[PDB]
Design an enzyme around this catalytic site. Structure first.
Site, PDB file in Angstrom:
ATOM      1  N   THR A 185       0.889  -1.235  -0.023  1.00 45.28           N
ATOM      2  CA  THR A 185       0.113   0.065  -0.164  1.00 45.28           C
ATOM      3  C   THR A 185       0.836   1.160   0.129  1.00 45.28           C
ATOM      4  N   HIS A 221      -2.737  -2.344  -5.511  1.00 45.47           N
ATOM      5  CA  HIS A 221      -2.016  -3.747  -5.647  1.00 45.47           C
ATOM      6  C   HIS A 221      -3.138  -4.780  -5.870  1.00 45.47           C
ATOM      7  N   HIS A 227       0.190  -9.852  -0.240  1.00 42.35           N
ATOM      8  CA  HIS A 227       0.950  -9.146  -1.514  1.00 42.35           C
ATOM      9  C   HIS A 227       2.031  -8.528  -1.160  1.00 42.35           C
ATOM     10  N   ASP A 240      21.523   3.431 -10.528  1.00 38.19           N
ATOM     11  CA  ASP A 240      20.513   4.683 -10.486  1.00 38.19           C
ATOM     12  C   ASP A 240      19.626   4.521 -11.708  1.00 38.19           C
ATOM     13  N   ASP A 244      25.619   5.619 -17.269  1.00 43.83           N
ATOM     14  CA  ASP A 244      26.827   5.976 -16.555  1.00 43.83           C
ATOM     15  C   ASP A 244      27.826   6.943 -17.426  1.00 43.83           C
TER      16      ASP A 244
HETATM   17  C1  LIG Z   1      12.724   9.123 -11.931  1.00 38.60           C
HETATM   18  O1  LIG Z   1      12.484  10.591 -11.776  1.00 38.60           O
HETATM   19  C2  LIG Z   1      13.292  11.138 -10.842  1.00 38.60           C
HETATM   20  C3  LIG Z   1      12.600  12.662 -10.919  1.00 38.60           C
HETATM   21  O2  LIG Z   1      13.220  13.494 -12.213  1.00 38.60           O
HETATM   22  C4  LIG Z   1      14.754  11.153 -11.149  1.00 38.60           C
HETATM   23  O3  LIG Z   1      15.244  11.513  -9.999  1.00 38.60           O
HETATM   24  C5  LIG Z   1      16.218  12.772 -10.029  1.00 38.60           C
HETATM   25  O4  LIG Z   1      17.556  12.129 -10.437  1.00 38.60           O
HETATM   26  C6  LIG Z   1      18.463  13.363 -10.467  1.00 38.60           C
HETATM   27  C7  LIG Z   1      19.889  12.309 -10.752  1.00 38.60           C
HETATM   28  O5  LIG Z   1      20.091  11.098  -9.919  1.00 38.60           O
HETATM   29  C8  LIG Z   1      18.509  13.914  -9.242  1.00 38.60           C
HETATM   30  O6  LIG Z   1      19.473  15.103  -9.406  1.00 38.60           O
HETATM   31  C9  LIG Z   1      20.405  15.124  -8.487  1.00 38.60           C
HETATM   32  O7  LIG Z   1      19.572  16.220  -7.611  1.00 38.60           O
HETATM   33  C10 LIG Z   1      20.407  16.678  -6.593  1.00 38.60           C
HETATM   34  C11 LIG Z   1      19.523  17.606  -5.602  1.00 38.60           C
HETATM   35  O8  LIG Z   1      18.497  16.749  -4.953  1.00 38.60           O
HETATM   36  C12 LIG Z   1      17.812  17.291  -3.972  1.00 38.60           C
HETATM   37  O9  LIG Z   1      16.939  18.533  -4.521  1.00 38.60           O
HETATM   38  C13 LIG Z   1      16.010  17.977  -5.240  1.00 38.60           C
HETATM   39  C14 LIG Z   1      14.816  18.970  -5.835  1.00 38.60           C
HETATM   40  O10 LIG Z   1      13.815  19.858  -5.010  1.00 38.60           O
HETATM   41  C15 LIG Z   1      14.845  16.879  -4.727  1.00 38.60           C
HETATM   42  O11 LIG Z   1      13.999  16.075  -5.730  1.00 38.60           O
HETATM   43  C16 LIG Z   1      15.759  15.521  -4.155  1.00 38.60           C
HETATM   44  O12 LIG Z   1      15.069  14.659  -3.498  1.00 38.60           O
HETATM   45  C17 LIG Z   1      15.840  13.449  -3.349  1.00 38.60           C
HETATM   46  O13 LIG Z   1      16.680  13.616  -1.885  1.00 38.60           O
HETATM   47  C18 LIG Z   1      15.618  13.551  -0.790  1.00 38.60           C
HETATM   48  C19 LIG Z   1      16.786  13.610   0.458  1.00 38.60           C
HETATM   49  O14 LIG Z   1      17.106  14.851   0.297  1.00 38.60           O
HETATM   50  C20 LIG Z   1      14.578  12.500  -0.827  1.00 38.60           C
HETATM   51  O15 LIG Z   1      13.601  12.678   0.032  1.00 38.60           O
HETATM   52  C21 LIG Z   1      13.967  12.251  -1.985  1.00 38.60           C
HETATM   53  O16 LIG Z   1      13.114  11.120  -1.722  1.00 38.60           O
HETATM   54  C22 LIG Z   1      14.884  12.274  -3.169  1.00 38.60           C
HETATM   55  O17 LIG Z   1      15.858  11.086  -3.159  1.00 38.60           O
HETATM   56  C23 LIG Z   1      15.811  10.372  -4.260  1.00 38.60           C
HETATM   57  O18 LIG Z   1      17.005  11.048  -5.073  1.00 38.60           O
HETATM   58  C24 LIG Z   1      18.176  11.057  -4.565  1.00 38.60           C
HETATM   59  C25 LIG Z   1      19.258  11.865  -5.228  1.00 38.60           C
HETATM   60  O19 LIG Z   1      19.006  13.429  -5.384  1.00 38.60           O
HETATM   61  C26 LIG Z   1      18.846   9.682  -4.189  1.00 38.60           C
HETATM   62  O20 LIG Z   1      19.897   9.979  -3.324  1.00 38.60           O
HETATM   63  C27 LIG Z   1      17.714   9.009  -3.299  1.00 38.60           C
HETATM   64  O21 LIG Z   1      17.973   7.678  -2.927  1.00 38.60           O
HETATM   65  C28 LIG Z   1      16.324   9.145  -3.772  1.00 38.60           C
HETATM   66  O22 LIG Z   1      16.728   8.123  -4.968  1.00 38.60           O
HETATM   67  C29 LIG Z   1      17.024  16.403  -3.179  1.00 38.60           C
HETATM   68  O23 LIG Z   1      16.331  16.804  -1.885  1.00 38.60           O
HETATM   69  C30 LIG Z   1      21.646  17.384  -7.096  1.00 38.60           C
HETATM   70  O24 LIG Z   1      22.249  17.636  -5.866  1.00 38.60           O
HETATM   71  C31 LIG Z   1      22.550  16.333  -7.899  1.00 38.60           C
HETATM   72  O25 LIG Z   1      23.583  17.119  -8.266  1.00 38.60           O
HETATM   73  C32 LIG Z   1      24.983  16.463  -8.056  1.00 38.60           C
HETATM   74  O26 LIG Z   1      25.325  15.088  -8.802  1.00 38.60           O
HETATM   75  C33 LIG Z   1      25.332  15.456 -10.293  1.00 38.60           C
HETATM   76  C34 LIG Z   1      25.631  13.793 -10.674  1.00 38.60           C
HETATM   77  O27 LIG Z   1      25.453  13.569 -12.024  1.00 38.60           O
HETATM   78  C35 LIG Z   1      26.220  16.636 -10.678  1.00 38.60           C
HETATM   79  O28 LIG Z   1      25.918  16.873 -12.177  1.00 38.60           O
HETATM   80  C36 LIG Z   1      25.977  17.571 -10.090  1.00 38.60           C
HETATM   81  O29 LIG Z   1      27.129  18.777 -10.156  1.00 38.60           O
HETATM   82  C37 LIG Z   1      26.073  17.310  -8.193  1.00 38.60           C
HETATM   83  O30 LIG Z   1      27.478  16.900  -8.122  1.00 38.60           O
HETATM   84  C38 LIG Z   1      27.780  17.183  -6.834  1.00 38.60           C
HETATM   85  O31 LIG Z   1      26.978  16.203  -5.934  1.00 38.60           O
HETATM   86  C39 LIG Z   1      27.400  14.916  -6.201  1.00 38.60           C
HETATM   87  C40 LIG Z   1      26.394  13.884  -5.381  1.00 38.60           C
HETATM   88  O32 LIG Z   1      26.685  14.226  -4.111  1.00 38.60           O
HETATM   89  C41 LIG Z   1      28.956  14.793  -5.910  1.00 38.60           C
HETATM   90  O33 LIG Z   1      29.384  13.452  -5.758  1.00 38.60           O
HETATM   91  C42 LIG Z   1      29.848  15.576  -6.785  1.00 38.60           C
HETATM   92  O34 LIG Z   1      31.059  15.564  -6.740  1.00 38.60           O
HETATM   93  C43 LIG Z   1      29.236  16.974  -6.921  1.00 38.60           C
HETATM   94  O35 LIG Z   1      29.656  17.903  -5.627  1.00 38.60           O
HETATM   95  C44 LIG Z   1      21.746  15.886  -9.084  1.00 38.60           C
HETATM   96  O36 LIG Z   1      21.079  17.065  -9.947  1.00 38.60           O
HETATM   97  C45 LIG Z   1      17.171  14.463  -8.538  1.00 38.60           C
HETATM   98  O37 LIG Z   1      17.321  14.792  -7.128  1.00 38.60           O
HETATM   99  C46 LIG Z   1      16.315  13.342  -8.547  1.00 38.60           C
HETATM  100  N1  LIG Z   1      14.845  13.573  -8.237  1.00 38.60           N
HETATM  101  C47 LIG Z   1      14.087  12.724  -7.362  1.00 38.60           C
HETATM  102  C48 LIG Z   1      12.920  13.385  -6.751  1.00 38.60           C
HETATM  103  O38 LIG Z   1      14.632  11.625  -7.039  1.00 38.60           O
HETATM  104  C49 LIG Z   1      15.054   9.628 -11.330  1.00 38.60           C
HETATM  105  O39 LIG Z   1      16.309   9.714 -11.938  1.00 38.60           O
HETATM  106  C50 LIG Z   1      14.123   9.016 -12.278  1.00 38.60           C
HETATM  107  N2  LIG Z   1      14.509   7.585 -12.669  1.00 38.60           N
HETATM  108  C51 LIG Z   1      14.682   6.905 -13.698  1.00 38.60           C
HETATM  109  C52 LIG Z   1      15.122   5.539 -13.667  1.00 38.60           C
HETATM  110  O40 LIG Z   1      14.522   7.563 -14.854  1.00 38.60           O
HETATM  111  C1  LIG Z   2      -5.648   8.091  -3.130  1.00 43.29           C
HETATM  112  C2  LIG Z   2      -4.532   8.269  -2.291  1.00 43.29           C
HETATM  113  C3  LIG Z   2      -4.886   8.164  -0.757  1.00 43.29           C
HETATM  114  C4  LIG Z   2      -3.791   8.313   0.162  1.00 43.29           C
HETATM  115  C5  LIG Z   2      -4.427   8.075   1.421  1.00 43.29           C
HETATM  116  O1  LIG Z   2      -4.394   6.714   1.763  1.00 43.29           O
HETATM  117  C6  LIG Z   2      -4.854   6.417   3.325  1.00 43.29           C
HETATM  118  N1  LIG Z   2      -5.761   7.045   3.688  1.00 43.29           N
HETATM  119  N2  LIG Z   2      -6.081   6.577   4.810  1.00 43.29           N
HETATM  120  C7  LIG Z   2      -5.149   5.388   5.082  1.00 43.29           C
HETATM  121  C8  LIG Z   2      -4.333   5.227   4.067  1.00 43.29           C
HETATM  122  C9  LIG Z   2      -3.548   4.296   3.567  1.00 43.29           C
HETATM  123  C10 LIG Z   2      -2.747   3.595   4.767  1.00 43.29           C
HETATM  124  N3  LIG Z   2      -3.201   3.223   5.840  1.00 43.29           N
HETATM  125  C11 LIG Z   2      -3.812   1.522   6.120  1.00 43.29           C
HETATM  126  O2  LIG Z   2      -4.698   1.165   6.678  1.00 43.29           O
HETATM  127  C12 LIG Z   2      -2.985   0.700   5.321  1.00 43.29           C
HETATM  128  C13 LIG Z   2      -3.599  -0.351   4.738  1.00 43.29           C
HETATM  129  C14 LIG Z   2      -3.246  -1.399   4.291  1.00 43.29           C
HETATM  130  C15 LIG Z   2      -1.784  -1.700   4.234  1.00 43.29           C
HETATM  131  S1  LIG Z   2      -1.053  -3.211   3.403  1.00 43.29           S
HETATM  132  N4  LIG Z   2      -0.582  -3.871   4.264  1.00 43.29           N
HETATM  133  O3  LIG Z   2      -2.208  -3.920   2.425  1.00 43.29           O
HETATM  134  O4  LIG Z   2       0.086  -2.888   2.617  1.00 43.29           O
HETATM  135  C16 LIG Z   2      -0.983  -0.682   4.603  1.00 43.29           C
HETATM  136  C17 LIG Z   2      -1.601   0.631   5.234  1.00 43.29           C
HETATM  137  C18 LIG Z   2      -4.005   4.122   6.875  1.00 43.29           C
HETATM  138  C19 LIG Z   2      -5.433   4.495   6.262  1.00 43.29           C
HETATM  139  C20 LIG Z   2      -2.620   8.593  -0.286  1.00 43.29           C
HETATM  140  C21 LIG Z   2      -1.485   8.770   0.742  1.00 43.29           C
HETATM  141  C22 LIG Z   2      -0.122   8.960   0.264  1.00 43.29           C
HETATM  142  C23 LIG Z   2      -1.386   9.970   1.569  1.00 43.29           C
HETATM  143  C24 LIG Z   2      -1.331   7.562   1.813  1.00 43.29           C
HETATM  144  C25 LIG Z   2      -2.387   8.910  -1.479  1.00 43.29           C
HETATM  145  C26 LIG Z   2      -3.366   8.742  -2.566  1.00 43.29           C
HETATM  146 CL1  LIG Z   2      -2.972   8.902  -4.192  1.00 43.29          CL
END
Ligand SMILES: *[C@@H]1O[C@H](CO)[C@@H](O[C@@H]2O[C@H](CO)[C@@H](O[C@@H]3O[C@H](CO[C@H]4O[C@H](CO)[C@@H](O)[C@H](O[C@H]5O[C@H](CO)[C@@H](O)[C@H](O)[C@@H]5O[C@H]5O[C@H](CO)[C@@H](O)[C@H](O)[C@@H]5O)[C@@H]4O)[C@@H](O)[C@H](O[C@H]4O[C@H](CO)[C@@H](O)[C@H](O)[C@@H]4O[C@H]4O[C@H](CO)[C@@H](O)[C@H](O)[C@@H]4O)[C@@H]3O)[C@H](O)[C@H]2NC(C)=O)[C@H](O)[C@H]1NC(C)=O
Ligand SMILES: Cc1cc(COc2n[nH]c3c2CCN(C(=O)c2ccc(S(N)(=O)=O)cc2)CC3)c(C(C)(C)C)cc1Cl
Ligand SMILES: Cc1cc(COc2n[nH]c3c2CCN(C(=O)c2ccc(S(N)(=O)=O)cc2)CC3)c(C(C)(C)C)cc1Cl
Ligand SMILES: [Ca+2]
Ligand SMILES: [Ca+2]
Ligand SMILES: [Cl-]
Ligand SMILES: [K+]
Ligand code: NA
Ligand SMILES: [Zn+2]
Length: 789
Positions: free
Chosen positions: A158, A308, A416, A672, A676
């Site tokens: 979920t 799911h 699931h 990623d 590369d």
């Molecule tokens: C699916 O779609 C998504 C969305 O488009 C794609 O993901 C993007 O991919 C980009 C490349 O991997 C990535 O870009 C990097 O962004 C960095 C800034 O990131 C922060 O800000 C953004 C914008 O608001 C935010 O979205 C980010 O969110 C991530 O991190 C937070 C934690 O802070 C998480 O809550 C969140 O879930 C999200 O995590 C995901 O992404 C991160 C990577 O950002 C992963 O680590 C996580 O596991 C998870 O997957 C961030 O808050 C930016 O800093 C990067 O720039 C560096 O690296 C490039 C390398 O090519 C370089 O050009 C730059 O110069 C810079 O280098 C410097 O830093 C390097 C790294 O530390 C360092 O080693 C160098 O030496 C340099 O100093 C880069 O631009 C973008 O963030 C994500 N976005 C999201 C939401 O995930 C994804 O690729 C798609 N997938 C496919 C398969 O197509």
């Molecule tokens: C349309 C939409 C709705 C919601 C709100 O969904 C929920 N509202 N209220 C509950 C939920 C789901 C979790 N939850 C469960 O009881 C639960 C049930 C089964 C399993 S399991 N075991 O089947 O995996 C795991 C957790 C607590 C009740 C979201 C967000 C992202 C805000 C959750 C995104 C979107 Cl687009």
């Protein structure tokens, strides 16, 4: 908070207030912050949910759960069946389907609202199997736009799936990689029970309600507290729909914990499941009736979607890691329908991932899970690039669980979480309303695509996400997204004959001109050259049987394209030919591979991208052994690749009436999902600059109408693709001791891929020059051949 405040005039207010005010929004319950009178005023139940004839025209009594008074429609708080019971109207489900060509909305509505109606655990096959008991849902499905199923994300749980619906992101990117997680950077644990999951740091990306709000479009709640009954959720949405124009949301969500809750207890098709399905259908009917009373039933777009499916799983079908590992107390397992392993203690210097993997690999003949290092998981799962995903993963067979020890398992008949291509995990999609098509079936598609579509429905720009925007245009009447093909960044060189044989030192054991300037290119490159979407140096090389884009930086093709007719002949490859790799006089020694590096590297051998087995003529066969067609391959992988090239390509040509094949390397050492750069490559062929691929792809295209040959196809296309892991063993394939005819095809099915997956991994853009609409091509690129019945 000052809980002495009151919810009078404020029940289910949309905007949360901070202390010292008490709250009356729907999240107040989850934060123990509701005003004292919230249950009394906001969760009324008196007289239940239905008008009866005796209540028609009543004097309004504020204590009732809903109203049957003359003023109820203007107040937006009638019971949903008010007009049926009291004004002689019909239920929505009893009305004929009538096409909704344009939105038919009250004055003041600036766009059709969207309501996302999410049903937990609603397996795809319920639409047929429950049809007799779900007349409202069946009407939405038959009158609107529906797919036969919608593919969830992995894990098929979920929280990962709902948050994917909300963001358009893979779990590895949004961060919700399971229902249970450990984040090593924050040293924090997420659980279904407890408070840690409320921390905003878990929830990445940009969910739809944020996208909307930042763009000036108001949202209803998405989370519903478990204790708010479904009928109250519906009534709340309908009251919000009655708000003033500058207060009323444009996007709403409903969530039902059924049929999932009962499915876990009873199994997906337990006899007990009928009632839940009837109940959900009743709720849909309440919503539709309520919309019709408000004159919104031809205004709002409704998406009926699940998260799911549900499989039969019992306590006895559990594999125990204590049957495999002597050191089971030194590991932590995230258990169930998936396994994730890490060290119990990061101070334990004896923990060794390799030893754990080996102890889990093909140990029992019927073993019901398979271990992977996460980078070796099928790429289609996109389940590796997050620190919350443990390095060690167990892919569990459908119908099974894994657990650490038997005491952990001392109820349920359904669960699931399995691989998202498993049929029992599939779910539903219906779209109904002015912006969706009428009485239209669309092919199955992935839930990652929906965020973009909801943004299109709302006039919003999507945040960056993993959908392919335009790939679902065929669901829509209007508000299509029309993108442009990405610009080609690097233009090819077209080298001629520039080097003499004696300039090379390869160390190998040892009308033609029309074919080298590209005279059969029309036959072998059927959809245009792929575009290279990054800066690099590459050459287009033409040959009688194949064309390639040869990278001077990676010393091998990025892509090799060839067409094999249904009548093609397969030939032998004597080893003297394989040994005598020939210089390519178009490409410098310095930008070529050599045989010596392979002879020196005791672990690495080589194969060929265009299959020498399928050479058309003597002249042509020489080309197959050019150094520019060679690629590094471990001996274990050559078994896989040779079977594909010698046996499977011709089999697919025979079945499909010819195929076009594009093959090539992939380098994804940082797992990623993205190409590369040259400086990311961790492994070279010993003593050389020849980089080692992590994977090999192929994209196999033919005519959807198989009565036309692949090279003379007038209409839509058909594709299947794979991304095979380039591994030094066949440990993944427990039967690999047998002939390849007994195991290779199984491995390939597991590693099935979308063309778009390959595009991300290679920086290439395919299908640039077809006869087809671009949106049709985008749908083709998102297709996954799943091999399920
Ligand atoms: C699916 O779609 C998504 C969305 O488009 C794609 O993901 C993007 O991919 C980009 C490349 O991997 C990535 O870009 C990097 O962004 C960095 C800034 O990131 C922060 O800000 C953004 C914008 O608001 C935010 O979205 C980010 O969110 C991530 O991190 C937070 C934690 O802070 C998480 O809550 C969140 O879930 C999200 O995590 C995901 O992404 C991160 C990577 O950002 C992963 O680590 C996580 O596991 C998870 O997957 C961030 O808050 C930016 O800093 C990067 O720039 C560096 O690296 C490039 C390398 O090519 C370089 O050009 C730059 O110069 C810079 O280098 C410097 O830093 C390097 C790294 O530390 C360092 O080693 C160098 O030496 C340099 O100093 C880069 O631009 C973008 O963030 C994500 N976005 C999201 C939401 O995930 C994804 O690729 C798609 N997938 C496919 C398969 O197509
Ligand atoms: C349309 C939409 C709705 C919601 C709100 O969904 C929920 N509202 N209220 C509950 C939920 C789901 C979790 N939850 C469960 O009881 C639960 C049930 C089964 C399993 S399991 N075991 O089947 O995996 C795991 C957790 C607590 C009740 C979201 C967000 C992202 C805000 C959750 C995104 C979107 Cl687009
Ligand atoms: C981020 C997040 C946090 C939490 C913890 O709880 C919440 N804390 N803060 C919010 C939530 C629930 C989600 N959420 C909404 O449903 C919402 C509320 C108001 C409006 S608004 N203001 O536009 O009308 C629009 C949307 C946004 C706010 C959960 C779980 C599942 C743990 C509850 C899931 C998520 Cl994805
Ligand atoms: Ca106040
Ligand atoms: Ca990469
Ligand atoms: Cl999980
Ligand atoms: K070798
Ligand atoms: Na094996
Ligand atoms: Zn469940």
């Amino acid at each position: 908070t000052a809980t002495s405040g009151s919810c009078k005039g404020r029940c289910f207010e949309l905007q949360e207030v901070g202390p010292p005010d008490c709250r009356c929004d729907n999240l107040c319950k989850s934060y123990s912050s509701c005003c004292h009178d919230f249950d009394e005023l906001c969760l009324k139940t008196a007289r239940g949910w239905e008008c009866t004839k005796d209540r028609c025209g009543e004097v309004r009594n504020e204590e009732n759960a809903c109203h049957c008074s003359e003023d109820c429609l203007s107040r937006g708080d009638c019971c949903t069946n008010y007009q049926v019971v009291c004004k002689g109207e019909s239920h929505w489900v009893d009305d004929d389907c009538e096409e909704i060509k344009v939105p038919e909305c009250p004055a003041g509505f600036v766009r059709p609202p969207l309501i996302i109606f999410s049903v937990d655990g609603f397996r795809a096959s319920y639409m047929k199997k429950g049809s007799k008991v779900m007349p409202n849902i069946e009407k939405l499905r038959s009158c609107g736009t529906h797919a036969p199923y919608m593919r969830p994300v992995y894990p098929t749980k979920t929280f990962p799936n709902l948050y994917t619906l909300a963001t358009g992101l893979y779990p590895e990117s949004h961060g919700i990689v399971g229902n249970s997680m450990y984040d090593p950077v924050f040293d924090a644990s997420f659980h279904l029970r407890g408070r840690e999951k409320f921390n905003h740091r878990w929830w990445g990306g940009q969910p739809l309600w944020i996208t909307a709000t930042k763009q000036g479009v108001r949202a209803g709640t998405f989370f519903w507290s478990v204790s708010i009954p479904h009928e109250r959720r519906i009534l709340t949405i309908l009251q919000w729909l009655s708000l003033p124009d500058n207060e009323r949301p444009s996007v709403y969500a409903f969530y039902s914990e059924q049929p999932d809750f009962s499915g876990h207890k009873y199994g997906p098709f337990g006899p007990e499941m009928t009632n839940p399905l009837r109940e959900i259908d009743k709720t849909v009917g309440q919503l539709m009736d309520g919309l019709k009373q408000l004159r919104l039933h031809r205004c709002v777009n409704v998406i009926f979607v699940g998260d799911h499916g549900m499989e039969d799983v019992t306590c006895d079908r559990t594999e125990f890691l204590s049957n495999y590992l002597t050191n089971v107390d030194d590991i932590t397992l995230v258990p169930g329908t998936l396994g994730r392993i890490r060290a119990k203690s990061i101070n334990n210097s004896k923990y060794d991932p390799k030893t754990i993997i080996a102890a889990l690999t093909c140990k029992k003949p019927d073993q019901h899970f398979k271990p992977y290092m996460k980078q070796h998981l099928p790429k289609r799962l996109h389940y590796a690039n997050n620190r919350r995903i443990e390095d060690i993963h167990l892919l569990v067979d459908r119908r099974w669980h894994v657990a650490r020890k038997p005491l952990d398992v001392y109820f349920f008949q359904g669960d699931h979480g399995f691989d998202n291509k498993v049929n029992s995990m599939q779910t539903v999609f219906v779209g109904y309303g002015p912006t969706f098509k009428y009485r239209t079936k669309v092919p199955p598609f992935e839930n990652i695509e929906l965020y973009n579509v909801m943004c299109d429905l709302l006039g919003l720009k999507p945040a960056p996400n993993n959908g392919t925007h335009g790939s679902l245009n065929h669901l829509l009447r209007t508000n299509t997204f029309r993108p442009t093909m990405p610009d080609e960044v690097s233009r090819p060189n077209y080298p001629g004959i520039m080097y003499l044989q004696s300039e090379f030192d390869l160390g190998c054991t040892c009308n033609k001109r029309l074919h080298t300037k590209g005279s059969t290119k029309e036959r072998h490159l059927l959809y245009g050259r792929p575009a290279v979407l990054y800066r690099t140096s590459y050459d287009i090389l033409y040959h009688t049987d194949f064309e390639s884009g040869y990278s001077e930086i990676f010393l091998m093709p990025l892509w090799t394209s060839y067409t094999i007719s249904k009548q093609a002949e397969v030939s032998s490859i004597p080893e003297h030919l394989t040994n005598c790799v020939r210089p390519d006089v178009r490409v410098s020694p310095g930008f070529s591979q050599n045989c010596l590096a392979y002879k020196n590297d005791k672990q690495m051998s080589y194969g060929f991208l265009f299959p020498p087995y399928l050479s058309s003529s003597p002249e042509a066969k020489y080309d197959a052994f050019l150094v520019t067609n060679m690629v590094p391959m471990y001996p274990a992988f050559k078994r896989v690749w040779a079977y594909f090239q010698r046996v499977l390509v011709k089999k697919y040509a025979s079945e499909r009436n010819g195929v076009n094949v594009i093959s090539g390397p992939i380098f994804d050492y940082n797992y990623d999902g993205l190409r590369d750069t040259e400086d990311e490559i961790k492994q070279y062929v010993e003593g050389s600059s020849i980089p080692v691929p992590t994977h090999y792809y192929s994209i196999i295209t033919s005519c959807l109408d198989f009565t036309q040959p692949a090279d003379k196809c007038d209409g839509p296309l058909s594709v299947s693709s794979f991304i095979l892991p380039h591994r030094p063993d066949n440990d993944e394939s427990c039967n690999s001791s047998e002939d390849e005819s007994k195991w290779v095809e199984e491995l390939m099915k597991m590693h099935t891929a979308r063309v778009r997956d390959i595009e991300h991994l290679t920086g290439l853009d395919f299908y640039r020059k077809t006869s087809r609409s671009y949106s049709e091509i985008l749908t083709l690129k998102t297709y996954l051949h799943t091999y399920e019945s």
